[PDB]
Structure formats: C-alpha cells, structure tokens
Design a protein around this ligand. Structure first.
Ligand SMILES: Cc1ccc(Cl)cc1-n1cc(-c2ncnn3cccc23)cc1C(N)=O
Length: 289
C-alpha cells in the first residue's frame, strides 16, 4: 500500500517552509536505505495539540478530495497519533520566490499562463464548495516553467450545506492585506472573497514581487506607516470602503488592471466568477500570442 508511508523511512533532506502551526520538509522516502527512494514534500504540525490535529486531519481530507492539474498532488499519510501529509515535491519552489528570482525574464505571456492556471485551480476548488482564504503567490508552487499549482490549504474552509459563506468566529492567522472588506469587517469568507484575493495575486504577479510594491507595503503607505496592530485593520476597512485600492503595476496591460479592479469590487455580487476570469485570461493570452 503506496499511500501508507513508514515514518522511519522518511529521510529529512531540507526544510521548505513554516507558518503558524505547520511546516513542510523535503524528505526522501527511502525504504531501501540506499538513497534511491522517492523525494516527497511532507507537511506536519509544529504544535500538534488536539484541536490542531483535528483541523489538520480535515485539511488532509480536503487535499485528498482534490484532483486537478493546478492543485498539488496528495500522495498519502504517515501515522506515528501524529500525522504527516505526504505530497509530490515541486522542485522550482513557491511562485513568490520564483518570480522574485527570475523577475522580468518572465514575460507578460508567461505571467498570464500562470494566472490562467491559478484561476482554473480555484474554479475547480470552488466546485467542491471549499474556500481557500489564503490565495497569495506565496501559496502557489512551481512545478516547471509551464505549470504552477495551488500548494497549501492550511486556511481552507468547507462551506455549510445551506450557506454561500463561512464565518470564522475566532480568527487565527489572517493575511489581511489579501482580504475582501467583508472578511475584514465580519470575518465572512466566500468564493467572492477568494476572487478578491485573486485580484491581489494578479497584482503580485504584475509587480514581479518588488518588495517596496508588495500589498502590505502599499496598503501601509496608504493608511500611514504609524498605524499598528488592530488600527491597521480599522484604517484598512475605511480605506477600502472609500475606494482606496492598490495602484496599477508599472507596465501592466490595461485589460489586466481592469480585471484586478473588478475583483476588488466592494459589492460581493459584482466580482467576476473564476469561470469567466479563466475565459477572459485565456482570451487575453490568445490576443497576445
Ligand atoms: C506554501 C507553504 C505554506 C505553508 C507552509 Cl508551512 C509551507 C509551504 N510551502 C510548501 C512548499 C512546497 N515546496 C515544494 N513542494 N511542495 C509540495 C507541497 C508543498 C511544497 C514550499 C513552501 C514554503 N512555505 O515556501
């Protein structure tokens, strides 16, 4: 049974990233002990407390239920009752790191390949009634020059059967610079708040991840760098409610700026669908090709 991985055969190779309650490591699954076994990504909990183990086991079922070209591939689990999630290893790292390293050597046509792929993983995700909540280029991974995948689901929620939003009553980690207004004010997440975050990803891509231009740097400038802690969220809400928005990235095509701004609509119902976004991005790619 290949989806059962023995703990004692997973050899630590390298640390890949950490956040909040988890980390991901590159490991070799080497049960022949001759360094020839498969290299894999392993997610585990940093503080494997009871409540986090239950959240993480639901995160694992989330990922196992997803099969899509632009979602990272589940391989299995490792039981010791601590839990390691086993995934394919994607060797070009996170899209945030990748773009920052190759920056303009990646051209507009390539950025839109990535954008289309991202959009299509999200659209698929939404057909299972999952809300990602953390869509940002740091959570997208690069398989090779032609393929990116959504690569972490640690904040992902499942919508209630009878509701189109999930309200998070005691928020933990919150990437508030990527959040829709309603998510800031009422902690409500929906496909439409994922679409809002996707306009932020498009922004990230077209700024080539220039740090002085990142969403946190730009929003902090607009509300004033003196704002701190919970005042950031107060002033960010006021800013967004008054149409303050991230700027058009330098050299961004018009049609691409129009899409970000349409994803950043205050009116939830006026944000585009991921299905229409993929249609539109692939049209733009076609026009450019
Ligand atoms: C995206 C992400 C979010 C949270 C955590 Cl703890 C790790 C990651 N992560 C996952 C990876 C990763 N790299 C390569 N293959 N792979 C498969 C699944 C996750 C990965 C890299 C990182 C990272 N933080 O840089």
């Amino acid at each position: 049974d290949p989806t059962q991985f023995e703990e004692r055969h997973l050899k630590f190779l390298q640390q890949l990233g950490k956040g909040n309650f988890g980390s991901v490591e590159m490991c070799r699954y080497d049960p022949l002990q001759d360094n020839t076994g498969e290299v894999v990504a392993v997610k585990k909990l940093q503080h494997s407390t009871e409540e986090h183990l239950r959240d993480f086991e639901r995160e694992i079922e989330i990922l196992k239920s997803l099969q899509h070209d632009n979602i990272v591939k589940y391989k299995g689990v490792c039981y010791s009752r601590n839990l390691k999630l086993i995934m394919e290893y994607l060797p070009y790292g996170s899209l945030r790191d990748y773009l920052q390293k190759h920056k303009e050597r990646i051209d507009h046509i390539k950025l839109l390949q990535y954008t289309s792929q991202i959009c299509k993983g999200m659209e698929y995700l939404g057909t299972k009634r999952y809300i990602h909540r953390d869509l940002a280029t740091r959570n997208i991974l690069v398989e090779n020059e032609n393929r990116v995948k959504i690569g972490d689901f640690g904040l992902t929620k499942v919508l209630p059967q009878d509701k189109e939003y999930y309200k998070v009553k005691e928020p933990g980690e919150s990437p508030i610079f990527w959040y829709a207004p309603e998510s800031l004010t009422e902690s409500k997440f929906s496909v439409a708040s994922d679409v809002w975050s996707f306009g932020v990803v498009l922004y990230e891509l077209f700024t080539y991840i220039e740090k002085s231009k990142s969403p946190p740097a730009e929003f902090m400038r607009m509300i004033g760098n003196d704002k701190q802690g919970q005042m950031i969220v107060f002033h960010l809400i006021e800013l967004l409610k008054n149409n303050g928005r991230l700027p058009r990235p330098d050299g961004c095509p018009d049609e691409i700026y129009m899409i970000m701004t349409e994803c950043w609509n205050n009116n939830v119902n006026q944000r585009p669908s991921f299905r229409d976004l993929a249609l539109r991005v692939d049209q733009i790619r076609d026009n450019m090709a």
